[PDB]
Structure formats: structure tokens, C-alpha cells
Design a protein around this ligand. Structure first.
Ligand SMILES: Nc1ncnc2c1ncn2[C@@H]1O[C@H](CSCC[C@H](N)C(=O)O)[C@@H](O)[C@H]1O
Ligand SMILES: Nc1ncnc2c1ncn2[C@@H]1O[C@H](CSCC[C@H](N)C(=O)O)[C@@H](O)[C@H]1O
Ligand SMILES: Nc1ncnc2c1ncn2[C@@H]1O[C@H](CSCC[C@H](N)C(=O)O)[C@@H](O)[C@H]1O
Ligand SMILES: Nc1ncnc2c1ncn2[C@@H]1O[C@H](CSCC[C@H](N)C(=O)O)[C@@H](O)[C@H]1O
Ligand SMILES: Cc1c(O)cc(O)nc1CC(=O)O
Ligand SMILES: Cc1c(O)cc(O)nc1CC(=O)O
Ligand SMILES: Cc1c(O)cc(O)nc1CC(=O)O
Ligand SMILES: Cc1c(O)cc(O)nc1CC(=O)O
Lengths: 264, 260, 260, 261
């Protein structure tokens, strides 16, 4: 900790970093999938969508899956991959290998693309034992519900599930990792600002999605996540309360896979 | 605007930049002082505190003062002045010139230092026609009220005034330019996020004060203010609502000098 | 018109609590109507008379030869406003199911929600259409744990889940009472920020207590006749008051999600 | 204790509206006491009986030989709970000032606020201490325009402005009623976010109407006996309910700002 303009004001940066919030949310999504799979083993798993939770989710499936393949429409996202054991395939390469080849016949398909993502037509080409589709919808919004087609994507699999992620007692427009991280920080700032002696509270946010998809720079994106989530200007010490508010907001994240019953 | 991850999601950056919010706030504070002065002319004006509103306030005072001197405890803040007509003096040079010299005898003294700023003892050494002290307090906070000594600073001047700045119907901990800018952006984000089709809203904020006082880099600080105040991810267009919400939150800023 | 003195105005909203209740129950009834696609039924059974059940049963009289409301509380027969709707307490329905053939509905609607109808009772029917109201609103761990909506969708050739939310706003349940309270509370927050408003009063009380503890439907209906909000202000706010309330009422979105 | 069924709990707060009112009036009375520094007075005049005036006038009985409450509404004599407090309506005070020497207070306290006593009436006194309650809370252009607190501080050797705010929270005025309503409304917002809560009811009504329109102080006092909040939830929330209310009551800060010269 340091001082601000003069020694009468303190500047406190949270120990909790943006990457720590991202890690907690992705781990909750990976654990939801793990719980839903009930320790079942698979020959080949295909995970659509590398950013932002896909990387850690694919890595978490290596223990029970002989082969894990991440599929992404953006080839540069091979850089966001967690481990060498995860195979990366461009959408162009997958489509080609499906038409002319027998190497692709997964028993576990996980769709994490969400809004404007994979089409139900591509999903229908598979015949897995388990199909998991991530529902990008958070709390109610007409515009988001209209563009969402999660139900149409659950067209294959003996066992089907929908990965849902919300914040308990708080409003979020989507279940997206980025949306949730931003909402956790924003909600923490509003409460932090009400602590006695606080002058102002800064959420250290920027359009991180732009660094990944517009600048096509995964390395820079990961560096940007290394910043303290919040910076506070105050007369008195707030370091304790600052981590407790952030932690409380991170703990509200609840992720689970809802099983979709289809008897045939 | 542009698209986000796919063409199904739009990315919109506000036309309103952080510098535009800063400019609106500083102009409101400068206008409050102008309205309070009622067109009175002065031989020498001394303004304590260059950052953040002081620079524009001193510039605006050249219309009514023969000489305008910005005084700051940080010598590198001479870089935040944008007009050569504004004279700069660090606190030590001023204190020395007061003891051994007659060149300093202002008829207009403006204290914008706020929390942990200029002591009432230094203010008591002047005998101006008008004294304006900026109250750093915003809405009620016990910790901030305890450290504040604005009333003790109003110890000289034939006419005395307290520059106050608040947000109508909204809570702000201080009247500081930076505090107001941050609160305007944060409150705008809260309302923008509730617009139909919005996925998430990003306030493009950072600890700008750090760039000025810790990195001692005014140039970099000014470059950082060129960023769009808010970035929005949405399914539908939100261009108008984005600017209208930020505009509405900037309009809530009310600055005025209360005469004592 | 005035408050303590003639310098302050007292404004009571033209929108009454009953008007908010009516709008919500009509949205739920319309969601069911849209989902039914004009299909006609010989016998409809609706579980849960309070609070939307009464109007929902009334709206089924056109396309249903017989509409029966079932409630665990016999005094809730008083909340029905049309003699064409038959009433049966839960014990009477259970008796008639064991010893009788008069009950064999082609349309079953469960509106009991939390701690309501058991899936075991629902499993005794074989209708053409089954509609179960999901009491869950936005995410809450405690509410999700007690909810068993999915287990209740165990019969019917066509199955649907009635869902009700507030667009861009948080609500713990889809319950009529919850939504009405939330609409009023959110309206108060925005009304209080209007210029010149001193304070805003939501005219609320534990209405559920009048119905289930005092067992007085008549008194409950009389209590809903109150203006939703009372405002104390310096200037006129009548227009803004009705606009803020209407806007919050319009966020209610009700629909039946078909379960394939 | 249960709601519609035994699966849902109904909890009424132990804290009653009267308890919130009492805490706010006591904070205002204590602010005045601190400011007076134990000074004794021959005659104190307090303008405005509702809502904090009654308890403030009561707290002045110890250090003042005579305490007179002045209210434009004669029925507000019913809100006084001690016979030691003399009551005079505005008309009687105005008559006694013109034709009489019985009124010459050394302590004048104006609690009328918005549309209250005129500076012209205040200027007719020459007390040792003058305290004017500032009705303004946080910033609002409309309230600021109608407010004339500064013009009311025209007499007294020692002058003070009674200010009351909520730390870190927005309130349009310093009025007892406004603060009570805001404490309850803010508590409801936080209570509703507790896990398992279905909905939260603030037990509010236009209490001011009972006092000034129905002219019924007795009924108004009875209406304050109600629990401040009623909660519907799946799990127990009794302790959190009380903690959030107490926390919001504790944010009230009242103090008299001394006006020099
Ligand atoms: N048709 C398609 N096939 C494969 N990947 C796709 C796709 N459309 C989009 N994607 C990828 O899927 C991701 C969409 S972003 C989804 C966010 C994610 N559910 C989370 O919560 O973190 C991006 O990596 C994008 O490049
Ligand atoms: N004793 C002193 N003399 C002169 N300048 C001082 C000072 N103490 C602090 N300052 C300066 O005054 C400023 C304090 S920041 C005040 C913020 C300003 N009122 C606003 O709203 O924009 C800084 O520029 C700091 O360097
Ligand atoms: N097992 C059961 N059988 C029939 N009715 C029941 C029941 N359990 C509860 N009820 C009734 O169903 C209602 C539950 S309250 C449900 C609120 C309603 N969905 C709304 O939004 O308005 C009450 O009328 C209650 O008495
Ligand atoms: N000119 C006047 N003289 C005396 N009393 C007046 C007055 N105008 C209004 N009043 C009274 O003063 C009170 C105004 S309400 C003020 C609220 C009070 N400050 C609080 O916080 O509780 C009412 O009792 C009203 O009848
Ligand atoms: C959830 C989601 C999505 O499915 C698609 C997209 O482009 N953005 C988001 C928001 C996010 O990534 O948080
Ligand atoms: C108002 C203020 C101040 O007087 C002193 C300081 O160090 N910080 C602030 C906050 C700000 O600049 O907004
Ligand atoms: C939704 C709901 C419910 O299913 C059961 C109960 O007891 N209360 C509510 C809340 C309400 O009526 O709004
Ligand atoms: C403060 C105040 C006032 O001075 C005059 C009035 O009519 N209403 C209020 C509001 C209140 O009593 O809370």
C-alpha cells in the first residue's frame, strides 16, 4: 500500500487479481461438468469454444478422456490452450475431417460457444454418449432470449445437459465468464465505495475481449488479467474489507449442469 | 461500432471520452467561480492546487485578472498548465517570496487543495479582496468529515466563498473532479447494463491519479483521458442510450460557490 | 394535495396495487392462452387459487366445458369471482379421485409453487396438456434447493412450464405478490431520485397475512384498492410517477416454455 | 411464523418503526446537547413539534427553567409527552410578542424546515443561542431552491445549524420521517438479497397524513408500533434482519455546525 496525492489519503490495490476471479469462475464451470459426468470415462471428447472457460474445461477432461480436442473458429486461440495434451482443431479442419475421415466420432461433445456460436446442424452430425451445451443466458432479457438457440443445440446424445451459471441474489445478463467477472467487480465496487472513509473506487477494467479477438493477442490478454481487480482511494485502511467484499461476490457464482430428460 | 466475438454481438465504444467528462466538470467549477466573482477584476490571483480542476480554473481567470499564479507543492504539475499566461510557482518558492519580498500580495486567493492540502496558517498570511476555498466534502461520510478543515481555511478576505460540487440525486464521497468523473461513469454503467440486449458494460477506468502523482507523468495521464468512457457488448444497437445516459449523469453535476 | 404546509405537495399514484396485480395475473393468463393455441378441453383442473389462479381459471371458461379450482385452503373459494368456476378443497379432490370417475381432466395447471402440490398427486392424472408454474425467479441457492418443478412435469402429451420474470431486474420468485412488491420497490427508488422529491412511500403491508392468517379475502381485496405509491415533493411529479410505475409494470414478461 | 405453507417462513422484525423514530430523534437531541455544552437558559423556544421537536423540547427541561414549543397546528400539543413543556400556537406567540414582555428567550431552536418560520419572525428575538435545523439532505436543486436556512440565522450571540445525514447513503432531507423511510427502504434492498428470501415488505404508509390531514396524533403513534419489516423466506433470517436494520440506523449522523460571526 501507498499514499495518493498527499499522505492524508491512502491508495489500496486489491490482492485479488482479475485472473484470480477468472480462475474461480472457470473452475466452477469445470467442476459443474465433472459432477454431471459422474466419473464416466470417454474415448474422445470434442469441446467447441476455447475462450474463456473452454481451455480449463478441456484440461479438466484429460483424466477421464483418452483424447480431448478443442475446436475454435479462430485458429490463434490455440495460444489460450492450457496443456500440450489438448488437441486443437480449427473449425475448417473439423468440418473437412468429418466429411472425409473416420477419426472424429466423439462419445462426449461439449458446446461452450453460446451466442452466435455453433449451429445445431453441426452438432446433429455427432452421436455421442453425452452432450453438454452451455446456456449463455443469465437473468431475463428479451433481446438475449430472442438470439439464444440453446434448446435447438440439444439434438443428440443418450444423456443431455445444459451448463448454467448464475450469481446468487444478483443480476447478470449472461453466464459468460467475462460477464460474470465484470459483474463481480462492478458489484464489489459499489459496496466498497460505501465503506467509511473511501473517496472513490476504481474497477481496473477494459475491453479484454478486444485484446483476444480484435488484436488477436492472447499473451497480452493474459498479462492484462494480472492487474488488481480494484484500486481504492481512502482516508483509513480498507484492505481487509476490500478482499472480503470481493470474495463474497466471487462466492455468489453458482454453476451446474441441468440434465435434460429424453427417454429414447 | 464493431462486432465482438462473432457478428451476432456488437461492441460499442462511447463517443464521450473521459477527457470530455473531466472538461465538463472543470468547466462547471470554473463557471461557479466566474458567477461568484460577478465580473470583478483583480491585479493578482493565486490558485493553490493545479490538479485536476486548477489548470482550467486559472486559465479562465486570465479573463478577469492581470496576473494568475498557479501554486502547487509538486513542481512537475507545471506540465498540466496549457497556457503560458498562467505563472507557476512551487510551494517552497512562494513561501520564500512571501518572507523576503513584496511581489506577492494577491487580491484573489483560491484554495483548491482540499484533503491534506494548504494549511489555514499559510492562507492567514494573505489579505485579499476575495477568498474562495474548495470544500472537498461530497455527501456525508464520517471519515472524510473528520479530516476536513475547510471552515478553518476561510480566515481572510473581505468577501469569502466556499466552492461546492455535488451530483443531484446521486451519492458522491467528495467534490473532487476525479471522484465525480468515476461516479458519473460507474452510475452510467449501472443504468446502461439494464438496457435490453446488453451483455455487459465496461467502464474504461484505471488509477489515473497514480499516473500523475506516482509516475509523475502528466503527458501519459492526458493520453489516458482520450479513451472512450464506456465500452458495451450487446446484441442490438445502444449508441443513443449510451451517450444519453452518460450525458444525463454529467448534467447532474452542480457546482456553486456558497458565500459566507 | 399539500403536506405539512402549502410549500410541499403530497401525490398519491393513480395506479393502485390491484392494477399492478391485475396486469401481472393477466400476463400469466395470456401466456397460458398463447401456449394452448385455442385448444378446447372437456375438464380443466387448476391447483392454487391465490393469487393468479382465480383469473387464470376464469380465462379458461371460454375453451373449457368445466373449470375446477383446487386449493388446500377451503376459504379461498371466496377469491373466485365467477360462479362458472367450480371449487374443491385438496381433501375433496383426493377423495373423489379414489372413489369416483367424475375427475379425469384433459388440462391440468399447477400454480402452487413452493411447498405446493406433490408430483405423486400430479402423476394420478393423464391429461392432454400439463402446465406447471415455476416459482423460481432469478438465481437463489435456497429457493432452487426447495423447488421441484421438474419432478412435477411427469404427465401430459404436451407439457409446459409457466415462467415469469422482470426484464433487466432481479426478483427472487415469479410469484404475483413478489413481482408486485418488486415493481413498487423499484419504482420508489427511481421516483425518489426525481428533482424536488422529499421522500417516497410504497403503500405495502403483508397482504399474504390477510389472506392466509386472518383468512379474510374481502379485507385483502379492499387493501389492494390503495394507491401503490405516495410521494412528498416540492414540485409536481404526477406524470413522472405514472410513467415510472408503468415502465416497471411493462418489464414483466410471462411465457410458457414447452418441455419436449 | 409460517406463510402460505410450512415450507415458507414469515418473520416480522423485532425493531419497530417507533424504535427507528426514537433513535433518529435522540441523535438530533444529543447533537443539540453536545453543541450547548451544558449551558443553562431562562427560557427556550422550540418551533415545530413534529416529529423531532417533542423529544428535543423534553431534553431541554434539565438545563432550561422554561421550555415552550411553538407550532402553527394547535392539535400538535398532543405529540408532547411531558407537562413541563409549555405549548403555544404560532398566533398566541405572535400576539404575546406584540403586546407583552413574557417572551424573551435566551435559546431559540427552529425545527420547522421547508416552508416553516420566516426569518422576519426569528429576527424579533435576541437570544444567547440560535439553532436552525437545515432540512436539506444530499443534493437536490428543487429542495435547495426552496430552502432559506441561511436567512433564518439572523440573531444570536452563538449560532448553529443542525444537520442530519446518513453516512454513505443518499437522503433528500434531514427530516425524521425521510430518514426513517430511507433506513427501512435501504434495509429492504439488502434483506431481499439474503439467501432463501422470497420477498421483503417495508411496513410503511403516509404517516404524515395521519398527523396533519386526519389530525390524529394518537393513531399516528399507534401506527409506529408496527414491525419495520416483514420477510418471507425458506430459511431463518431473524438475526440478519435485525443486523441490517441496526446497521442502517447506525449510519444516521446528526450534529450542529457552529456558524462563526
Ligand atoms: N461456430 C463455431 N465453432 C467453434 N467455435 C466458435 C464458433 N463460434 C464461436 N466460437 C468460439 O467460441 C467462443 C465463443 S465465446 C463463449 C464464452 C464462453 N462460453 C465463456 O463463458 O467463457 C470463442 O472462443 C469463439 O471464437
Ligand atoms: N500545501 C499545498 N500547497 C499547494 N498545493 C498543494 C498542497 N497540498 C496539495 N497540493 C496540490 O493540490 C492538489 C490537491 S488535489 C485537489 C483536487 C481538486 N480539488 C479537484 O477537484 O480537482 C494537487 O495538485 C496537489 O499536488
Ligand atoms: N397441495 C396443495 N394443493 C392445492 N393447493 C395448494 C397446495 N399447496 C398450496 N396450495 C395453494 O396454492 C397457493 C400457493 S401460492 C402460489 C402463488 C401463485 N403461483 C402466484 O404467483 O400467485 C395458495 O393458494 C395455497 O393455499
Ligand atoms: N411558521 C411556523 N411556526 C411554527 N411551527 C410551524 C411553522 N410552519 C410549520 N410548522 C410546524 O413545524 C413542523 C414542520 S415539519 C419539520 C420536520 C422536523 N424538522 C423533523 O425532522 O422531524 C410541523 O410540526 C409544522 O406544523
Ligand atoms: C456469454 C457470451 C456469449 O455466448 C457470446 C459472446 O460473444 N459473449 C458472451 C459474453 C461473455 O463472453 O461474457
Ligand atoms: C477531493 C480530493 C482531495 O481534496 C484530495 C485528494 O487527495 N483526493 C481527492 C479526491 C479526488 O481527487 O477526487
Ligand atoms: C412464489 C411463492 C410460492 O410458490 C409459495 C409461497 O408461499 N410464496 C411465494 C411468493 C409469492 O407468492 O410471491
Ligand atoms: C424535512 C421536511 C420539512 O422541513 C418540511 C416538510 O413538509 N417535510 C419534510 C420531510 C420530513 O419531514 O421528513
Amino acid at each position: 500500500m501507498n499514499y495518493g496525492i498527499t499522505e492524508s489519503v491512502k491508495t489500496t490495490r486489491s490482492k485479488i487479481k482479475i485472473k484470480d476471479i477468472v480462475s474461480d469462475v472457470v473452475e466452477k464451470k469445470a467442476n459443474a461438468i465433472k459432477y454431471f459426468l459422474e466419473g464416466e470415462e470417454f474415448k474422445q471428447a470434442i469441446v467447441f469454444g476455447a475462450y474463456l472457460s473452454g481451455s480449463y474445461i478441456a484440461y479438466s477432461l484429460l483424466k477421464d478422456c483418452e483424447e480431448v480436442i478443442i475446436v475454435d473458429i479462430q485458429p490463434h486461440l490455440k495460444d489460450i490452450l492450457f496443456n500440450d495434451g489438448i488437441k486443437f482443431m480449427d473449425l475448417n479442419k473439423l468440418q473437412l475431417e468429418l466429411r472425409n475421415g473416420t477419426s472424429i466420432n466423439p462419445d462426449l461433445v461439449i458446446d461452450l460457444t453460446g451466442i452466435g456460436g455453433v449451429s445445431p446442424d453441426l452438432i446433429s452430425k455427432f452421436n455421442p454418449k453425452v452432450l453438454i451445451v452451455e446456456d449463455p443466458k443469465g437473468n431475463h432479457d428479451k433481446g438475449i432470449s430472442k438470439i439464444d438457440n440453446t434448446d435447438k443445440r440439444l439434438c443428440v446424445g443418450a444423456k443431455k445437459g445444459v451448463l448454467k451459471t448464475y450469481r446468487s441474489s444478483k443480476f447478470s445478463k449472461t453466464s459468460g465468464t467475462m460477464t460474470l467477472v465484470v459483474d463481480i467487480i462492478m458489484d464489489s465496487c459499489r459496496e466498497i465505495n460505501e465503506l467509511d472513509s473511501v473517496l472513490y473506487t476504481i474497477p481496473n477494467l477494459k475491453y479484454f475481449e478486444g485484446t483476444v479477438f480484435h488484436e488477436k493477442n492472447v499473451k497480452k490478454f493474459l498479462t492484462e488479467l494480472n492487474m488488481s481487480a480494484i484500486t481504492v482511494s481512502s482516508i483509513d485502511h480498507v484492505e481487509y474489507e476490500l478482499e472480503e467484499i470481493l470474495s463474497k461476490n466471487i462466492s455468489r457464482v453458482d454453476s451446474f449442469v441441468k440434465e435434460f430428460d429424453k427417454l429414447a
